[PDB]
Amino acid sequence: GNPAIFASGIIMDSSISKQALSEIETRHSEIIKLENSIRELHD
Amino acid sequence: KNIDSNPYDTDKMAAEFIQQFNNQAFSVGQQLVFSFNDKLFGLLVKDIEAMQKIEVGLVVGNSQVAFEKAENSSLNLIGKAKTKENRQSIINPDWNFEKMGIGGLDKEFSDIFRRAFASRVFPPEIVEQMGCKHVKGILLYGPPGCGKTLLARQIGKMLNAREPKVVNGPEILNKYVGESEANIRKLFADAEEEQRRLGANSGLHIIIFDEIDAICKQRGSMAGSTGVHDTVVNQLLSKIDGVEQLNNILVIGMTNRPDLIDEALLRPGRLEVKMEIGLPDEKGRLQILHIHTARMRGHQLLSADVDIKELAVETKNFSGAELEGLVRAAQSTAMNRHIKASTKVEVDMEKAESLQVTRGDFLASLENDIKPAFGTNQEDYASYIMNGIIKWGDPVTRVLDDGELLVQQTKNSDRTPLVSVLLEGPPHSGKTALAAKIAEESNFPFIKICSPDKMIGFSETAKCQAMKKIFDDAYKSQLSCVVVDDIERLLDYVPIGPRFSNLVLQALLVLLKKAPPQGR
Amino acid sequence: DWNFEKMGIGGLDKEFSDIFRRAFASRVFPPEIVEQMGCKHVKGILLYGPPGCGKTLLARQIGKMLNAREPKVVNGPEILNKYVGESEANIRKLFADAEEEQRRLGANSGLHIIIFDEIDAICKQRGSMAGSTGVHDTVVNQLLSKIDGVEQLNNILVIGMTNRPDLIDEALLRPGRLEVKMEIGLPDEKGRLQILHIHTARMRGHQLLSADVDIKELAVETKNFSGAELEGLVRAAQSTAMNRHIKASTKVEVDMEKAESLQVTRGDFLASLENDIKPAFGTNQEDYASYIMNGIIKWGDPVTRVLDDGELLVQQTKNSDRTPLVSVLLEGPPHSGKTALAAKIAEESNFPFIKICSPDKMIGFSETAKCQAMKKIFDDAYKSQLSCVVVDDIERLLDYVPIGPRFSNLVLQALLVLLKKAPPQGRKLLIIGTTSRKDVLQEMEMLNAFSTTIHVPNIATGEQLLEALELLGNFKDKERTTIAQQVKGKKVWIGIKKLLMLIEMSLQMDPEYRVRKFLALLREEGASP
Amino acid sequence: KNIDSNPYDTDKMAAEFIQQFNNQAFSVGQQLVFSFNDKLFGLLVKDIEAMQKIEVGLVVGNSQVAFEKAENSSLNLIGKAKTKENRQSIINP
Numbered sequence A: 001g002n003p004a005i006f007a008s009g010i011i012m013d014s015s016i017s018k019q020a021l022s023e024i025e026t027r028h029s030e031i032i033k034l035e036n037s038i039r040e041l042h043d
Numbered sequence B: 001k002n003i004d005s006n007p008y009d010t011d012k013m014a015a016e017f018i019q020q021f022n023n024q025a026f027s028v029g030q031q032l033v034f035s036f037n038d039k040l041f042g043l044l045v046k047d048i049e050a051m052q053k054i055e056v057g058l059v060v061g062n063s064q065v066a067f068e069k070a071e072n073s074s075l076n077l078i079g080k081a082k083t084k085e086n087r088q089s090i091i092n093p094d095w096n097f098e099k100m101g102i103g104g105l106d107k108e109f110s111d112i113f114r115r116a117f118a119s120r121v122f123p124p125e126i127v128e129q130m131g132c133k134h135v136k137g138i139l140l141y142g143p144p145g146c147g148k149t150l151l152a153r154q155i156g157k158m159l160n161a162r163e164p165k166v167v168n169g170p171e172i173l174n175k176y177v178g179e180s181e182a183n184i185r186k187l188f189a190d191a192e193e194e195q196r197r198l199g200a201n202s203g204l205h206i207i208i209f210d211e212i213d214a215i216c217k218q219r220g221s222m223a224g225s226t227g228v229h230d231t232v233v234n235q236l237l238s239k240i241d242g243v244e245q246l247n248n249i250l251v252i253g254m255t256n257r258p259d260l261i262d263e264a265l266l267r268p269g270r271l272e273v274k275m276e277i278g279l280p281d282e283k284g285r286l287q288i289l290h291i292h293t294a295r296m297r298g299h300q301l302l303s304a305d306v307d308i309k310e311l312a313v314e315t316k317n318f319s320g321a322e323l324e325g326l327v328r329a330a331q332s333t334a335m336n337r338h339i340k341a342s343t344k345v346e347v348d349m350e351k352a353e354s355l356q357v358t359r360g361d362f363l364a365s366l367e368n369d370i371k372p373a374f375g376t377n378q379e380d381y382a383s384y385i386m387n388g389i390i391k392w393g394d395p396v397t398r399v400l401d402d403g404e405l406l407v408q409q410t411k412n413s414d415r416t417p418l419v420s421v422l423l424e425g426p427p428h429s430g431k432t433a434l435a436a437k438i439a440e441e442s443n444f445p446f447i448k449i450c451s452p453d454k455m456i457g458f459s460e461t462a463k464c465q466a467m468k469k470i471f472d473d474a475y476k477s478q479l480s481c482v483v484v485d486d487i488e489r490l491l492d493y494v495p496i497g498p499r500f501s502n503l504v505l506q507a508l509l510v511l512l513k514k515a516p517p518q519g520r
Numbered sequence C: 001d002w003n004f005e006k007m008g009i010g011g012l013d014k015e016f017s018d019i020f021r022r023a024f025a026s027r028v029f030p031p032e033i034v035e036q037m038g039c040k041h042v043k044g045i046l047l048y049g050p051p052g053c054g055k056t057l058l059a060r061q062i063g064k065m066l067n068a069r070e071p072k073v074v075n076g077p078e079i080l081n082k083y084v085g086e087s088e089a090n091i092r093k094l095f096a097d098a099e100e101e102q103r104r105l106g107a108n109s110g111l112h113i114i115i116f117d118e119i120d121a122i123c124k125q126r127g128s129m130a131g132s133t134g135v136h137d138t139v140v141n142q143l144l145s146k147i148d149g150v151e152q153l154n155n156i157l158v159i160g161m162t163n164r165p166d167l168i169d170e171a172l173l174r175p176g177r178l179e180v181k182m183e184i185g186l187p188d189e190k191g192r193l194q195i196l197h198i199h200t201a202r203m204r205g206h207q208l209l210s211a212d213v214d215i216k217e218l219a220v221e222t223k224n225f226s227g228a229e230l231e232g233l234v235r236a237a238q239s240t241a242m243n244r245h246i247k248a249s250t251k252v253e254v255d256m257e258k259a260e261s262l263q264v265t266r267g268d269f270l271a272s273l274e275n276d277i278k279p280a281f282g283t284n285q286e287d288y289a290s291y292i293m294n295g296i297i298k299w300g301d302p303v304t305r306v307l308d309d310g311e312l313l314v315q316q317t318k319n320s321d322r323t324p325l326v327s328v329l330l331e332g333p334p335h336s337g338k339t340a341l342a343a344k345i346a347e348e349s350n351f352p353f354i355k356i357c358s359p360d361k362m363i364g365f366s367e368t369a370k371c372q373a374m375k376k377i378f379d380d381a382y383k384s385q386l387s388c389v390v391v392d393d394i395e396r397l398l399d400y401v402p403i404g405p406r407f408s409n410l411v412l413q414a415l416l417v418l419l420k421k422a423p424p425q426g427r428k429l430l431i432i433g434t435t436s437r438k439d440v441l442q443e444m445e446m447l448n449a450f451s452t453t454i455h456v457p458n459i460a461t462g463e464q465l466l467e468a469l470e471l472l473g474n475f476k477d478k479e480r481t482t483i484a485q486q487v488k489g490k491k492v493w494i495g496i497k498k499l500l501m502l503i504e505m506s507l508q509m510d511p512e513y514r515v516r517k518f519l520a521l522l523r524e525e526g527a528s529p
Numbered sequence D: 001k002n003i004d005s006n007p008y009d010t011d012k013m014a015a016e017f018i019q020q021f022n023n024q025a026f027s028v029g030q031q032l033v034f035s036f037n038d039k040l041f042g043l044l045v046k047d048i049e050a051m052q053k054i055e056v057g058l059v060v061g062n063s064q065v066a067f068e069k070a071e072n073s074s075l076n077l078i079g080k081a082k083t084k085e086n087r088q089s090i091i092n093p
């Protein structure tokens, strides 16, 4: 029947986002403070 | 833990063994550890010989050592000092012909074995002195239900190779560009890899194409799908025998129409062993019946009345599948004779113990169930002879005697393999009945009637193909008889005009003087 | 360390000499003079021919012959892909190394080889008509642009092989891109001898070959064998003995005591010739046995005459130089047995190529199919140095019938045109044609095409009939005498093929009635000369 | 590691077990290792009957052994020296 047909173009989709990265900064920031605290305790 | 497939030079390690163990006592069966190039090996003394066999000896500078790898060991030894290389045979030790379960194909199997496997079992050293490659293909063709797939399967499980890949018809086609070729190329990758890695020591690989004629067609002939099919054929041709050489493959194909396959794919160096599987003769039928009725004889489920020789005689022009179906129906009859549950399935036990397949079951099944495709049909005569034959005068006897003479001539002659005759007379004289009473008393194993009333509304080409098919079928028996009746109706003659079909007339004229293959 | 005999190709001396002269001559001469001549380098080769004559072998050997990089190999349509614009990226990838090395090292770079296998799969002619654009024309454009574009390359070499030189796009073959074209054809006797020596050297080295095997006889006996077929012959001959020393019907076993006298003898070669290998441009005895079913018997003078006239014609076509194409027509009444005589003459011709075109293999074909089949059969005969072709039962080929009359015009035109096309220069063809109704052909204006005619008669005297009976030997002395007294005083009109059938019909009666029935049938047949 | 689906003749291995462990004490629930055709199997005593059920007994030459594969085991046992049986009820009332 129909000859072999070409495929169409692709449309990718990035995952990470600026605001979600601000949220990841919220995640990361507290860790350093907690680290300062634990280092104090050990010292 | 330290097993590796890397080659080890038996010469260097033998010299190291002599150096390390010079002037040392060694006895048969002695176990020790040898360090060669920082690799530890377990050595066992198998035999000793004085420069006479001696249980214990002394290793000296000029002592000679021959190394052989242990059974099931992956050690790769290279050199000439070694004597036993432990080349694992390419055939399972258990196999023997009888257990294959194939009967009536001795000559064909002999030829295939001679031409395809003879060079993979002779000692390798002799083979290497001839520098000859191995055959690369086999092709099988014949009428339906004669035992091709069975032979392919049995060969596949013959060898000690890995499992064989299977392609079921056209399961490689796809709609997107350049996908079929990828599917084709995917098949050979393992063989290519193993070849590159291991050279002459690689194991065997098998591929099986099923209904190959659905993919490989002559290039430039078809229309509407030329591109895809041409690409597929070109890819296959390039892969099988290309610039890079392969020497560890074997391809098996099977088809029903050996004429449609391309020509460039059937030259030596490619699929080059062509075989034809045909109907069996008496011995073949006897062998097949013996094969298919072994277990029951073992368990004493077979009555003493059945005589296999009589059954072999009475079934003419049967094929293997039909010989199987006959036995299956015969068994089903006996099994049902004990069960008695129309309302709700309800098996019995009293006579479910003394199950016995008797002659009567075989006869009844033979007369009601199976209908061979190349045999004689009886309903036809019932339809075409509706009121019998009445002896109202000498001419009937005259005609019948002439028919008998012609039949005898065609069965006993050798210089006249083909005969013809024409029956004619005024309308409503009953020619068809006489013709179908001279065919029935022929007693030939193949009879057929070609009548116009099976082609109502057909066009010329359809009628031509139908007649050609009938004659092609007739060409596959040791005897035959074909009745063509109402020729004018076949030609579509009408006195006005006149008008008629030229193509059918030409086809009939050609067919009326074509001799069958030799001996038939 | 290269050497010619190491190549292992036989029967292709001239082609290799020409390829070497045209392609590699300028890359070996001292560079200074070449610079003084200011010439570029050839950058292409194309090879075409019928299957199994040794193309891929030559390409592979050329690849091995050079002190250069490793060639890149493309297996047919190995570049096609489904995403837009990928099947052209695949093409562009191949030339990257050449481009980079050129840019860097100027005029001191190495040499890069590329091999296209089955090129005609992705390089067909461009449609060049609106709305008929090919499925893929971007690939062809990309390849054309890359091979010879605005920027210049001087360190590549492209090789292509194909079976159909007529479909390649014509812009791809001009003297700038693929300049050297070669046809690889069947070999002659010397080539066959060389090939057999090449393939038997190893066996002869280790005394595995018997003494009675003479190569020259085999070379003479194999006429029109392609390259691969000789190898197949040798392979089967080898396999036979190895089988001889293998008992396997219950459990595979290899007797190793008598396996140290392995030796190949001529009988194996003869058997392999008889059964296994079957050529494609040669001939085999099955066809003649199919047509000459009951031999030929000298029942009278005319037979000899006929055969003699055949011989003369054959001789002419072998030695004449002005007339490279001759034809003849055999004609006579029905059941005179003419096709058999044509087959006999053709078989006695001893030409390498003999083919028989018969209606028996065209049942139900439409006229177009008949035209194409005849065209193909004839075309196959233009690729030999000597050919003979037989056309059987012309009237059946035209689908003739007295009413109307009614026939096929297209096939008649095909034949009329095809009886005066001379072959490619330097080759000889003979055509024989059989029929049974001369007058009809006369009306169609066809007797002009043929060069001469021969007449085949019937049996017309009692003496001839008695001689025929005696040769066949069906009837014994007393019956023969009775038949003589009955028939010796009359005249007869019958054909041999009918005589056999009459004898067979007669023989079925009782022992004491055969003569009378035979005479009755002979009387009833009727003469009507 | 050495698990395989190959069939094992229960009769032969039962005879070998009797030969190896004749005139030996065996108790219900006992765990042991059995070598059959160079293959190691774990055996657990499930039931003992006097030649009545007994906690401990003596295995003799004519003692009868019935083997059953462990739950979820891929061991392929063939022969009649096994208690497991199969019958398909492909029809119903």
Ligand SMILES: Nc1ncnc2c1ncn2[C@@H]1O[C@H](COP(=O)(O)OP(=O)(O)OP(=O)(O)O)[C@@H](O)[C@H]1O
Residues within 6 Å of the ligand: B101, B102, B103, B104, B105, B143, B144, B145, B146, B147, B148, B149, B150, B151, B288, B291, B320, B321, B324
């Ligand atoms: N030579 C034989 N001896 C014994 N049994 C045979 C033989 N040939 C066929 N049979 C039996 O008949 C069956 C035929 O099936 P099989 O697949 O071999 O036929 P086939 O040639 O593949 O049919 P088709 O080609 O039309 O698909 C086999 O499965 C087997 O049961």
Ligand SMILES: Nc1ncnc2c1ncn2[C@@H]1O[C@H](COP(=O)(O)OP(=O)(O)OP(=O)(O)O)[C@@H](O)[C@H]1O
Residues within 6 Å of the ligand: B384, B385, B386, B387, B388, B389, B390, B391, B392, B396, B426, B427, B428, B429, B430, B431, B432, B433, B434
């Ligand atoms: N001795 C006989 N010879 C012929 N037919 C007979 C004889 N006795 C009875 N019949 C019956 O006569 C009928 C003849 O019909 P049938 O079809 O053979 O004739 P037909 O020649 O084919 O007819 P039409 O010429 O019309 O096609 C059948 O039923 C046939 O069995």
Ligand SMILES: Nc1ncnc2c1ncn2[C@@H]1O[C@H](COP(=O)(O)OP(=O)(O)OP(=O)(O)O)[C@@H](O)[C@H]1O
Residues within 6 Å of the ligand: B264, B269, C008, C009, C010, C011, C012, C050, C051, C052, C053, C054, C055, C056, C057, C058, C163, C195, C198, C227, C228, C231
């Ligand atoms: N002139 C020759 N001398 C020696 N061997 C030859 C010669 N020609 C062909 N052969 C043999 O033929 C074998 C296969 O031939 P080859 O690979 O050239 O086929 P091909 O011509 O490429 O076929 P195709 O047209 O199908 O591509 C070679 O390996 C070699 O053994």
Ligand SMILES: Nc1ncnc2c1ncn2[C@@H]1O[C@H](COP(=O)(O)OP(=O)(O)OP(=O)(O)O)[C@@H](O)[C@H]1O
Residues within 6 Å of the ligand: C291, C292, C293, C294, C295, C296, C297, C298, C299, C303, C333, C334, C335, C336, C337, C338, C339, C340, C341, C436, C496, C497
């Ligand atoms: N001397 C002979 N000449 C020709 N044929 C002979 C001779 N002796 C025996 N025969 C046999 O006689 C038969 C001649 O039949 P053939 O087919 O050649 O006749 P035809 O003329 O082609 O037939 P038609 O004209 O009916 O088509 C063949 O079997 C041939 O071998």
